[PDB]
Amino acid sequence: KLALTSVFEGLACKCIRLQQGGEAAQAEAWEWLAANQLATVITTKESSATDEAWRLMISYLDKYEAKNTLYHHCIINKLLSHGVPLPNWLINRYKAMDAAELLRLYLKYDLLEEAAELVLEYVDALLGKGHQYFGIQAPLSATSQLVWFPYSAIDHLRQALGENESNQHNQAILSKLQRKMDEYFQKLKKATDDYKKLVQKPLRA
Amino acid sequence: MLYHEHLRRDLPNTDNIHQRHPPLRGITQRELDGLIACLQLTCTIIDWSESARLALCEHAQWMPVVVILGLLQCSIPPLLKAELLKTLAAFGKSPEIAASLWQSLEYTQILQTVRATGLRQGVGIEVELNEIESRCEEYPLTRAFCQLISTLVESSFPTNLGAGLRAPGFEPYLQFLRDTVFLRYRTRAYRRAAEKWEVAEAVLDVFYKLLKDYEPQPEDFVDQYVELQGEERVAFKPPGFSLMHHLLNESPMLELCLSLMEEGVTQLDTYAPFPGKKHLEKAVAYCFMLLNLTLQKENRFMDLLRESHLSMIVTPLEQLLQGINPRSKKADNVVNIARYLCHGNSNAELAFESAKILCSISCNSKIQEKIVGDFTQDQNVSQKLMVGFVSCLDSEEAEELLDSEKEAEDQVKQTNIRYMTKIHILNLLITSLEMKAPNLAMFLLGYELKKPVSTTNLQDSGVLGCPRTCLHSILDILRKGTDVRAGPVAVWDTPHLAELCYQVIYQLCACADTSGPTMRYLRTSQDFLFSQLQHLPFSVEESEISAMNQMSWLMKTATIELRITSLNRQRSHTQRLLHLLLDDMPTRPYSADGEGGMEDESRSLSGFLHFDTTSKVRRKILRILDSIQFSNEIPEPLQLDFFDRSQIEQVIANCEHKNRRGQTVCNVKLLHRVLVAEVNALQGMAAIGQRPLLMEEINTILQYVVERNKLLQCLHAKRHALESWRQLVEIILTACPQDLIPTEHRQLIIRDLLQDLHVKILDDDAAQELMPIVAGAVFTLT
Amino acid sequence: MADKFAAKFVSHKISRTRWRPVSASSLQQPDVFATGSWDNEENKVCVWATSDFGATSLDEEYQGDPKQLCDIKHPGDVMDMQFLDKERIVTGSSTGTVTIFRHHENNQTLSVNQRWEQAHYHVGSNMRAPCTAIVCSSPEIVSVGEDGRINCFRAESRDVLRTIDDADSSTMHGVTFLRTTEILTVNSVGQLKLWDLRKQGNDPTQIFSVTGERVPLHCVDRHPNQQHVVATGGQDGMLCIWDVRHGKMPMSLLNAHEAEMWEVHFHPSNPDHLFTCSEDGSLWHWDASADSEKPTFLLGGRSTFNISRSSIAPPNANQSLACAWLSTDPTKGQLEITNLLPSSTLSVNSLDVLGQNLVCGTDAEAIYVTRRLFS
């Protein structure tokens, strides 16, 4: 009954070392990959040892779901600590589970561009565009459940993008983010006013 | 971590300009020496052990990369920062860590890559270099930063570097290394005179690596636009494009490289030891390697630039090398390059890279006449340059050690460098002899350029004050061992060198302007053709292609000599060469295995009748035909498990080019790149697991292409020898006076030649490519 | 050598000339400079371009007349001028005003960006006093005046950041940055003074002067790579070299001009060269590079000749990178000295040097420009 955290950190570290490693690290990787039950090694002549190591990681995440995002968090925090770009499949799974924790992880590692794209997509998801990619059951409506908006992490992102006044790129991102936040606050105000109108129609039933 | 946490609590918040605080509790000297020793031990362990490097970097509690980068932002001594950067460089040797270090370097702004409009006081390495290191007159941090960049460029090159913060690409680091480090290194004060060269080496290593792996693509010549914060900005070009642009224009970078080569040769001409000599020699070597990579990539870069819509003009590097040196006020850059050959016995690497540049520039017809002008303008320089080329050809050690696999790797590297220097000098001579007179080969071979070349009197070195020339070195290489029963030593030990030597002699005899002086000298002073032809055929089991071409060039030279001596009625000399080729010489059997007995110089002339010992008396011209095999083994057809054979044959055909000798061969390096690019384009979890097997099959494809290239070169060499033999036979029959060969003996010789040619071509394994030459010979013989 | 300078008559006296700073990352030569006038009915600041029309002829003598791009009226004489950056020019006025002008390249105009109308004035009378010299270290500006005051400004600050009242009891003539927070000033009583701008007091940190009779010092410049080496020029036309770490006396005193020395400048990127101009109508180039022939340790050769000069130097200072300007060895310090202008100009009031280019301004109502200083 031990925590699987050390297993996921170590597998993430082996995947990182494989991705950074030359032909020798790829040759050594087949030995330890074969020692683990990949229930479906079709040795097609086209899969690198790195691709099979990532398939193993996906299969362990699917077999061993933690109640709290701990294993996905632990892998992402480990990948970011080594400066490795996050795989799109891992981002998309974690977007559907906890987008607010992902934003804090990008901010912890100064990934301001990816953090801003995540906030733009999350705001678009709340506005009703791509809400399925974030696990949001219903978009912003007068009758929908209140989705928790990570306002403090977005304000830290706005501060971190604003501290660098010299970077025309960070200002272009910050202005794109502000314009989207204003669109959200206008639609939130309208949905709140339409909820107030729904509450103000008199009970004649 | 404790030092990182303590030093970060003391960073002053920007809002209190008024109170004198007491002195910073700085790291004590003993703690500093301890931290340095720990970092140096850490560097040494992770430098040699990849498993230790990964295990330390991934350690969740220590976060070494974050702590080290955080300490670089603190006000610590530059020596400790330099050791911290070396520790990051040693971590950056693994590609997984290197990619994360690039992202962390951009986030930490250790070099300012983002210029905000309003801060006139930059924080980072550029200010530490200009304010701290410049005052100490010592540059350990700048060198450690260049070492970090050199290691990161070698392990991982990220295309999206700085994406979202700035325009993506390496350009801010290139600008710092070029404009702030390299262009200013000479203007700086140095406490240690050697460190001047350590800084130059460290930056030039980065430039060499960036240009080595860069190949010009059509995409590099199109302005890509990237949206940043709501404005469209042009993306940065790849660093190798920027380096090519500065090396192919009149740039301060090219001028600094050329002046470093001038400073290098000027210090070497002192023949004295000086501090940092080894680092100056390496910095000059990287300048040579950069110019040589530029010359190799120049044609492709200019063709793509001409196809592009960019309003950029670029000048051939060979024309920029004819520029006025700002220091000498003369066009002496090519002369300063060639003076490194005078140091070939003391520094073989710089003489090799000099020979390689000179061989590359000499390919261009417009430049030959000017180079000859520059080399001959000063009589004292002209003589020193001649000595440089001659001394590199005369080097004895380059022939002696190619077969000892058991001696120190560095001696084998140096002997191979000297051998390859001879090959580049001979290729320079051959390529220059194909050009119109006056050319560089005529100078180096000893021709008088002040008079018509055809009036030159060639003489042995030292006679009437004639200098030693590359012609003398070439003749001495081919004469070494001619007194021994085995023939010329260079035919056996260095077969490709001997091939090029015979090719130069043939071209001198074949060219109308040089033929008269050359053949007179070869006949009267050297007896060269008789001494060499006595040893035909040459038979070398490991190097058949080179041996066949050596025989071809020698036979063609003999064909010219027999024709010209016959036309000029030089009967005694023509008769002597005909007797060597046509007289019945006893076969000496070649077999180095036969312990057997010094007894039989004593049995007597007698006995004109009985036919049962073929004492193998066989004419030299038939023995030369015997050594030409008409059959060839065809490589087995490729069996492939993952790649389609039909597509590979099309890719091989797209990788075929004419070699410098006019032969069609497949470019194995271009083929390997196309195949590896296709394996890298394969996306999926199945392709990652099969990657070792795909790379093994790429190796089987490459082996097959090497065997196919060997077959094509062998067929060409067989064709070349048979054509040279046919021309020799035709001149013997058509141009030689009829009374030199009795009518009976002439008929017997022609019948024997017709029978042997027919037997060899009627064989089922006989190469169809030889049939046109054989049928031409059968027609002339009949 | 007269053939090196293009001369432009401008019909007003030129008090100051400065090159526009080029980017250190650009291979671009400086092509733009500014000038200030004095002793005219209407004084002005002008911006000029050197003509580059593309002589692809290696053999045509340079006759590229400087072209005025634009000008602006200046209240009183331009007493000193510096570029703060590529777009901004700072001026000291005989009215005691410090002014920042902005150059607008797109329309070739000048505009007042900022002004301090009472930077210099006499205490108690509130009468304006001339601002005699200014120095820039962007965004910081320092001025000095005939009121003996030192003022510190920042280009974006409307208020004076600091005044050192009663800093001198005499006219200050020149100011330069020793370091980011330390300046040197020169005055009408032959003193060089070091100031720490962070020190809350009004007293100089150090005072330097010649021994014996003191003459006014008019100009001061600091060696670009060697912050402790300073040059000054004065009323007697003498060039003084100082080590501001080693004593209170000059290290060298050189006969440079026959009248008042107006400016001295080290070459910014090649500081083995120094330039001086004077009231005597001369512009001198000083070359100290003759000792940069690396000591090729070889061989011996005897011979004697005596000439007396007194210097007491104690025999223990390490051979650390001898500044050519501090060399006391009469056998090694061959200064080459060249007059750059033809004999017979009026006063050469100002010079500036950038890369291969030198500009100077004169009382002959003329600007002289060369682009081949060392050719």
Side-chain angles (χ1 to χ4, degrees):
Chain A
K1 303 179 179 177
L2 303 175
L4 293 166
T5 44
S6 55
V7 185
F8 284 110
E9 289 188 355
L11 182 62
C13 191
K14 284 212 179 206
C15 294
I16 292 162
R17 284 179 178 176
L18 269 173
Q19 188 174 357
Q20 293 178 352
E23 293 183 343
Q26 297 185 3
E28 287 182 0
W30 286 110
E31 189 176 7
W32 71 258
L33 284 167
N36 299 287
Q37 291 175 358
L38 286 165
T40 55
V41 187
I42 304 176
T43 46
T44 53
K45 287 186 174 182
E46 296 184 348
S47 54
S48 73
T50 321
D51 299 312
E52 286 303 343
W54 284 118
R55 284 175 179 171
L56 185 65
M57 183 68 86
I58 293 164
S59 82
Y60 287 171
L61 287 171
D62 291 349
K63 284 178 181 177
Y64 307 113
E65 291 187 343
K67 292 184 178 181
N68 294 352
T69 44
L70 297 172
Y71 304 147
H72 293 89
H73 177 101
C74 175
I75 295 161
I76 291 170
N77 184 69
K78 196 63 177 171
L79 287 165
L80 295 181
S81 76
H82 286 282
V84 181
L86 295 179
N88 288 340
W89 67 261
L90 182 63
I91 298 172
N92 289 342
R93 280 186 172 192
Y94 201 73
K95 279 177 178 174
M97 294 178 82
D98 192 341
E101 198 178 25
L102 188 52
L103 180 61
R104 292 179 193 118
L105 284 169
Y106 288 140
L107 287 169
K108 182 184 173 193
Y109 292 103
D110 298 320
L111 291 173
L112 304 181
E113 293 180 359
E114 299 296 333
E117 291 200 349
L118 181 69
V119 173
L120 287 169
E121 288 185 8
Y122 187 71
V123 172
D124 268 326
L126 288 167
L127 291 172
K129 295 178 181 177
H131 73 89
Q132 297 179 4
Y133 297 112
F134 289 94
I136 299 171
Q137 293 185 0
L140 201 96
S141 70
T143 51
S144 50
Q145 291 179 350
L146 290 167
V147 184
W148 217 69
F149 191 73
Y151 187 77
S152 53
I154 295 170
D155 271 359
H156 291 161
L157 179 63
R158 288 169 69 192
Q159 185 182 342
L161 286 171
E163 281 175 6
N164 285 323
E165 292 190 342
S166 57
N167 233 356
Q168 289 183 353
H169 196 63
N170 289 359
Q171 290 186 351
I173 294 170
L174 184 146
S175 64
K176 189 182 177 192
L177 195 110
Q178 280 180 349
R179 183 177 60 99
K180 262 297 185 188
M181 287 295 285
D182 292 334
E183 190 185 346
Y184 175 78
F185 287 128
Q186 286 179 17
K187 200 175 185 176
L188 186 79
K189 188 176 182 178
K190 190 179 179 181
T192 310
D193 289 337
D194 289 339
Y195 180 71
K196 283 175 181 173
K197 288 172 193 159
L198 266 151
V199 177
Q200 283 181 353
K201 268 186 176 180
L203 286 124
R204 275 191 176 182
Chain B
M1 186 179 167
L2 288 175
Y3 282 113
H4 176 62
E5 285 193 20
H6 289 145
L7 293 169
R8 202 183 194 188
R9 286 182 189 96
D10 290 339
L11 197 69
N13 279 352
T14 354
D15 278 344
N16 279 322
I17 290 172
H18 296 311
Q19 260 151 65
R20 288 178 177 164
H21 282 284
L24 290 123
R25 200 182 193 182
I27 303 173
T28 65
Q29 187 63 32
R30 292 185 182 172
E31 288 162 332
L32 187 83
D33 298 331
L35 287 174
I36 288 169
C38 294
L39 288 171
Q40 284 177 359
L41 177 60
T42 305
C43 292
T44 308
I45 291 168
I46 67 190
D47 272 327
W48 289 109
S49 182
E50 179 164 31
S51 59
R53 193 188 305 152
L54 294 174
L56 288 179
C57 191
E58 294 183 349
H59 198 271
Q61 295 177 349
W62 299 338
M63 301 183 289
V65 174
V66 180
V67 177
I68 290 167
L69 289 170
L71 283 169
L72 289 170
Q73 296 180 348
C74 297
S75 297
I76 53 165
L79 288 171
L80 182 62
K81 294 196 180 201
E83 298 299 301
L84 287 172
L85 288 181
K86 289 174 189 169
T87 312
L88 293 179
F91 276 121
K93 285 181 172 170
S94 289
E96 303 78 5
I97 303 172
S100 79
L101 282 173
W102 272 123
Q103 294 179 6
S104 304
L105 280 171
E106 287 292 351
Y107 183 79
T108 54
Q109 294 289 314
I110 289 169
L111 181 69
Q112 291 192 343
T113 66
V114 185
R115 294 185 180 169
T117 33
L119 276 94
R120 284 193 177 186
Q121 284 179 333
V123 178
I125 292 179
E126 179 163 38
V127 176
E128 295 186 7
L129 168 58
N130 288 315
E131 296 193 358
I132 306 178
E133 292 195 306
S134 70
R135 285 183 187 177
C136 294
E137 307 182 348
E138 290 179 17
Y139 305 90
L141 180 71
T142 290
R143 289 183 297 136
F145 186 71
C146 297
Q147 186 178 0
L148 174 63
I149 300 296
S150 175
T151 309
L152 288 178
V153 167
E154 184 168 21
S155 59
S156 72
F157 190 80
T159 47
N160 294 337
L161 186 65
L165 291 171
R166 59 176 185 85
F170 186 89
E171 183 62 21
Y173 297 95
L174 185 61
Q175 287 179 4
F176 173 75
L177 291 176
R178 185 189 67 219
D179 303 331
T180 302
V181 192
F182 189 61
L183 291 182
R184 299 184 184 194
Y185 94 85
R186 291 190 173 169
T187 52
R188 281 178 180 133
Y190 294 91
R191 191 183 184 180
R192 295 186 298 115
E195 186 169 41
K196 179 187 170 193
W197 310 125
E198 297 173 30
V199 175
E201 181 184 346
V203 181
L204 284 168
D205 180 52
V206 181
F207 295 163
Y208 169 68
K209 288 175 173 190
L210 289 171
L211 187 61
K212 183 188 177 193
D213 301 328
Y214 173 65
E215 286 294 353
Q217 301 306 329
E219 295 171 4
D220 302 335
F221 301 87
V222 186
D223 292 333
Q224 296 180 1
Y225 295 83
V226 181
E227 279 187 328
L228 278 153
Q229 300 183 355
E231 291 195 334
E232 290 182 341
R233 292 189 177 178
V234 186
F236 295 124
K237 297 195 177 197
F241 177 99
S242 188
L243 290 176
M244 285 289 284
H245 175 63
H246 291 84
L247 292 173
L248 298 173
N249 281 307
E250 295 184 350
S251 82
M253 180 174 174
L254 179 64
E255 291 182 359
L256 188 58
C257 287
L258 294 177
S259 62
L260 183 66
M261 295 178 167
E262 187 190 351
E263 192 170 8
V265 73
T266 302
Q267 292 294 352
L268 292 177
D269 274 14
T270 73
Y271 291 98
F274 59 87
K277 180 181 171 192
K278 295 175 181 164
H279 296 298
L280 175 60
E281 288 173 322
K282 287 185 177 190
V284 169
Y286 287 121
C287 287
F288 273 108
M289 295 171 92
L290 281 171
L291 293 187
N292 178 35
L293 283 175
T294 305
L295 288 171
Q296 288 172 31
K297 297 180 182 182
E298 181 181 316
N299 290 316
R300 185 176 178 138
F301 186 90
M302 287 203 288
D303 281 323
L304 291 174
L305 187 68
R306 187 180 70 224
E307 288 173 8
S308 83
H309 297 316
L310 290 171
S311 66
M312 290 177 66
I313 303 175
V314 177
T315 307
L317 175 55
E318 63 209 37
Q319 294 180 19
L320 298 172
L321 292 176
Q322 300 178 357
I324 301 168
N325 176 352
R327 192 177 187 175
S328 74
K329 303 182 178 182
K330 297 180 183 182
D332 67 348
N333 299 317
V334 187
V335 171
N336 289 327
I337 287 163
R339 281 168 63 200
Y340 280 96
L341 297 173
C342 305
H343 294 286
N345 295 359
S346 60
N347 188 325
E349 288 178 4
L350 292 181
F352 168 70
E353 287 300 342
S354 169
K356 191 173 178 190
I357 290 197
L358 289 168
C359 186
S360 302
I361 299 166
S362 69
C363 294
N364 289 329
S365 175
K366 294 179 181 173
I367 294 178
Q368 282 283 341
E369 188 179 1
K370 290 183 181 184
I371 290 179
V372 174
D374 299 334
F375 279 29
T376 60
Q377 190 181 32
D378 183 344
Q379 189 68 33
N380 287 333
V381 176
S382 186
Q383 293 297 315
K384 286 177 181 184
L385 291 181
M386 186 65 72
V387 175
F389 283 98
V390 168
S391 67
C392 292
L393 289 175
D394 287 342
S395 71
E396 295 184 330
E397 291 168 35
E399 290 167 11
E400 301 194 318
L401 290 169
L402 282 165
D403 292 339
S404 56
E405 291 189 335
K406 291 187 179 178
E407 291 190 342
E409 289 192 3
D410 287 345
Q411 283 179 352
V412 181
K413 284 165 195 160
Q414 286 184 17
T415 53
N416 190 11
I417 289 163
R418 292 182 188 193
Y419 173 79
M420 293 295 168
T421 304
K422 299 190 184 190
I423 297 300
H424 283 300
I425 293 169
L426 292 181
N427 281 307
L428 173 161
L429 293 175
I430 290 165
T431 311
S432 303
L433 282 175
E434 293 178 2
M435 304 297 121
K436 295 183 181 178
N439 63 46
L440 180 61
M442 288 178 176
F443 174 59
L444 293 178
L445 294 165
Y447 287 86
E448 284 185 28
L449 306 178
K450 294 183 181 176
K451 294 185 198 134
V453 176
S454 57
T455 65
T456 304
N457 287 313
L458 299 172
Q459 299 190 358
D460 302 320
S461 60
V463 185
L464 300 180
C466 293
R468 192 174 174 79
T469 70
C470 298
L471 180 62
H472 300 96
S473 302
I474 289 166
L475 290 173
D476 290 344
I477 291 164
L478 292 180
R479 280 175 140 211
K480 194 175 174 187
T482 54
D483 300 336
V484 188
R485 288 184 180 192
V489 174
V491 166
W492 308 102
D493 300 1
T494 53
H496 187 60
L497 184 71
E499 190 202 357
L500 296 176
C501 286
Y502 284 120
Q503 184 175 352
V504 173
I505 293 177
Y506 167 70
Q507 284 183 344
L508 286 179
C509 290
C511 180
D513 296 324
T514 53
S515 60
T518 308
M519 296 180 313
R520 183 179 177 179
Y521 179 64
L522 291 181
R523 191 187 306 138
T524 57
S525 296
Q526 300 285 320
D527 203 20
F528 173 84
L529 289 172
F530 185 90
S531 184
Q532 296 298 347
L533 288 171
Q534 84 193 332
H535 295 301
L536 286 181
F538 305 142
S539 61
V540 187
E541 295 185 350
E542 299 184 349
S543 281
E544 299 188 343
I545 301 175
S546 294
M548 198 66 70
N549 284 314
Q550 293 161 19
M551 293 194 284
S552 303
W553 293 128
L554 182 58
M555 281 189 283
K556 284 178 167 176
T557 309
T559 300
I560 293 166
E561 179 68 354
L562 280 173
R563 182 179 176 190
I564 291 178
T565 54
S566 296
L567 287 173
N568 291 323
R569 306 181 177 184
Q570 294 179 347
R571 205 175 186 129
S572 52
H573 189 74
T574 311
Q575 183 174 356
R576 184 182 175 200
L577 290 178
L578 285 174
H579 281 310
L580 185 67
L581 293 174
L582 301 181
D583 292 353
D584 269 336
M585 290 295 292
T587 43
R588 295 182 179 175
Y590 275 84
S591 13
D593 289 335
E595 294 192 334
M598 182 73 181
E599 291 193 349
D600 266 340
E601 276 198 340
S602 63
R603 288 195 175 156
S604 314
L605 287 98
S606 193
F608 197 78
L609 293 173
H610 271 287
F611 225 91
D612 278 337
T613 17
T614 41
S615 52
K616 291 170 183 179
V617 185
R618 190 164 175 86
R619 300 184 184 94
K620 197 73 143 182
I621 201 158
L622 293 175
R623 292 179 63 176
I624 295 165
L625 183 63
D626 296 334
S627 65
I628 305 167
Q629 294 175 359
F630 280 33
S631 53
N632 265 342
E633 295 180 352
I634 303 170
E636 290 191 356
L638 276 163
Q639 285 176 0
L640 295 168
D641 288 330
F642 312 83
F643 292 103
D644 180 13
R645 183 177 175 186
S646 82
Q647 295 181 5
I648 285 165
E649 287 292 341
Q650 290 178 13
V651 176
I652 290 167
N654 292 339
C655 299
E656 285 179 6
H657 67 82
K658 292 184 182 178
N659 271 347
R660 294 184 181 186
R661 296 184 174 179
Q663 297 166 0
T664 43
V665 300
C666 182
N667 187 335
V668 186
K669 294 185 180 182
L670 191 143
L671 180 63
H672 179 64
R673 286 175 178 180
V674 173
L675 294 173
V676 171
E678 205 64 11
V679 172
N680 290 329
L682 289 168
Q683 294 191 352
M685 286 274 98
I688 301 178
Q690 292 179 339
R691 191 179 182 101
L693 300 172
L694 290 171
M695 293 293 280
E696 192 171 9
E697 195 179 34
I698 287 173
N699 293 329
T700 64
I701 296 162
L702 293 172
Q703 284 176 354
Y704 176 78
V705 171
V706 170
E707 290 182 355
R708 181 171 167 168
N709 278 339
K710 185 180 177 182
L711 175 65
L712 290 176
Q713 289 177 14
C714 182
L715 283 170
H716 183 92
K718 285 176 169 184
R719 184 183 170 151
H720 184 206
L722 188 64
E723 178 56 18
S724 304
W725 177 94
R726 183 190 72 78
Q727 288 178 19
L728 182 61
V729 172
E730 281 178 3
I731 288 305
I732 291 167
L733 296 177
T734 60
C736 295
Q738 290 183 346
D739 353 300
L740 289 178
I741 308 171
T743 311
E744 302 308 323
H745 288 77
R746 185 177 176 126
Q747 287 182 46
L748 290 171
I749 292 161
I750 293 166
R751 290 172 193 184
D752 296 349
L753 290 167
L754 281 168
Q755 288 181 3
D756 284 349
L757 281 177
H758 281 141
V759 171
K760 287 188 166 218
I761 201 58
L762 289 177
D763 192 24
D764 282 334
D765 296 330
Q768 296 186 358
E769 300 188 354
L770 301 179
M771 292 181 175
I773 298 170
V774 180
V778 171
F779 175 85
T780 53
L781 286 169
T782 52
Chain C
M1 227 184 278
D3 313 315
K4 288 190 175 188
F5 284 84
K8 187 56 162 187
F9 188 76
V10 299
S11 310
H12 57 280
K13 296 177 173 185
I14 301 299
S15 59
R16 294 293 179 261
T17 58
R18 299 293 175 244
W19 286 110
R20 180 171 297 191
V22 294
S23 190
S25 60
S26 68
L27 289 163
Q28 289 180 319
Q29 294 187 343
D31 62 340
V32 177
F33 64 94
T35 68
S37 77
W38 77 299
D39 192 39
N40 297 110
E41 294 185 352
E42 296 197 320
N43 288 305
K44 59 186 176 181
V45 174
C46 299
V47 178
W48 305 81
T50 60
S51 59
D52 256 340
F53 291 116
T56 20
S57 37
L58 277 157
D59 297 325
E60 286 179 331
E61 290 166 340
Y62 201 89
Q63 223 171 34
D65 267 16
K67 183 182 176 184
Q68 201 181 291
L69 299 184
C70 62
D71 66 89
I72 191 167
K73 296 190 179 193
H74 188 271
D77 309 305
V78 183
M79 298 302 294
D80 200 11
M81 184 183 298
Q82 292 296 350
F83 278 92
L84 181 66
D85 54 53
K86 293 191 171 194
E87 297 184 350
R88 296 185 294 175
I89 301 161
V90 187
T91 50
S93 171
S94 63
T95 69
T97 298
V98 177
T99 303
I100 310 186
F101 299 103
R102 174 176 283 138
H103 181 233
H104 299 276
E105 292 187 33
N106 295 341
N107 68 357
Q108 300 298 341
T109 62
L110 284 167
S111 64
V112 179
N113 178 222
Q114 191 151 277
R115 185 178 289 176
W116 300 273
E117 296 191 346
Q118 295 189 308
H120 291 274
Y121 67 90
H122 293 295
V123 180
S125 70
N126 293 338
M127 293 189 287
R128 288 174 177 188
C131 176
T132 48
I134 65 96
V135 67
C136 295
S137 171
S138 194
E140 304 297 329
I141 301 165
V142 176
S143 73
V144 301
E146 294 190 348
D147 61 358
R149 293 184 166 167
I150 304 170
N151 294 294
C152 302
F153 322 82
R154 182 175 292 169
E156 297 67 26
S157 179
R158 293 185 179 190
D159 303 316
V160 190
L161 295 186
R162 181 177 181 232
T163 300
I164 318 188
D165 282 302
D166 307 313
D168 212 308
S169 61
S170 68
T171 298
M172 293 188 289
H173 294 299
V175 61
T176 191
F177 282 107
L178 189 75
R179 304 194 180 98
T180 310
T181 63
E182 291 170 318
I183 62 169
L184 288 166
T185 66
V186 290
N187 72 13
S188 68
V189 298
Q191 299 180 319
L192 170 71
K193 292 184 174 174
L194 175 60
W195 310 84
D196 181 350
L197 297 183
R198 298 174 170 157
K199 186 184 174 194
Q200 291 291 318
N202 297 2
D203 303 302
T205 304
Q206 303 190 45
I207 307 181
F208 312 83
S209 59
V210 300
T211 41
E213 191 168 4
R214 292 181 292 186
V215 296
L217 288 177
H218 293 311
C219 54
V220 59
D221 188 33
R222 184 208 69 202
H223 186 304
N225 299 329
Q226 300 194 41
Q227 294 176 354
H228 59 275
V229 183
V230 180
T232 64
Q235 177 162 19
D236 64 351
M238 298 295 292
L239 175 60
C240 305
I241 307 301
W242 316 80
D243 185 334
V244 299
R245 305 171 301 174
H246 295 123
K248 295 185 177 184
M249 306 309 310
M251 291 296 299
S252 191
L253 181 68
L254 303 172
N255 285 43
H257 295 300
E258 297 292 323
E260 292 75 3
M261 184 184 304
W262 293 131
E263 296 191 0
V264 59
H265 297 272
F266 289 97
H267 191 283
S269 68
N270 190 8
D272 298 333
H273 307 258
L274 174 151
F275 301 86
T276 56
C277 68
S278 176
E279 189 60 22
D280 72 11
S282 79
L283 172 70
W284 288 26
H285 170 220
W286 305 75
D287 194 333
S289 71
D291 208 22
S292 73
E293 282 269 337
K294 287 173 178 170
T296 43
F297 267 90
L298 283 187
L299 297 160
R302 180 182 174 176
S303 201
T304 47
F305 279 106
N306 293 321
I307 303 181
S308 305
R309 280 188 167 188
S310 60
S311 56
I312 299 169
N316 259 7
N318 287 312
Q319 296 174 13
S320 177
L321 296 166
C323 193
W325 301 105
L326 297 183
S327 188
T328 52
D329 189 342
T331 66
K332 297 182 186 143
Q334 196 166 11
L335 289 167
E336 181 174 1
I337 306 170
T338 297
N339 188 354
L340 293 187
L341 292 179
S343 52
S344 79
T345 71
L346 298 178
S347 190
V348 185
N349 300 316
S350 192
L351 74 93
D352 193 15
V353 65
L354 186 58
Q356 290 289 343
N357 315 270
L358 186 155
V359 62
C360 66
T362 67
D363 261 30
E365 308 185 334
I367 303 166
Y368 300 80
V369 183
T370 189
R371 299 188 60 190
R372 304 186 182 174
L373 186 58
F374 306 116
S375 70

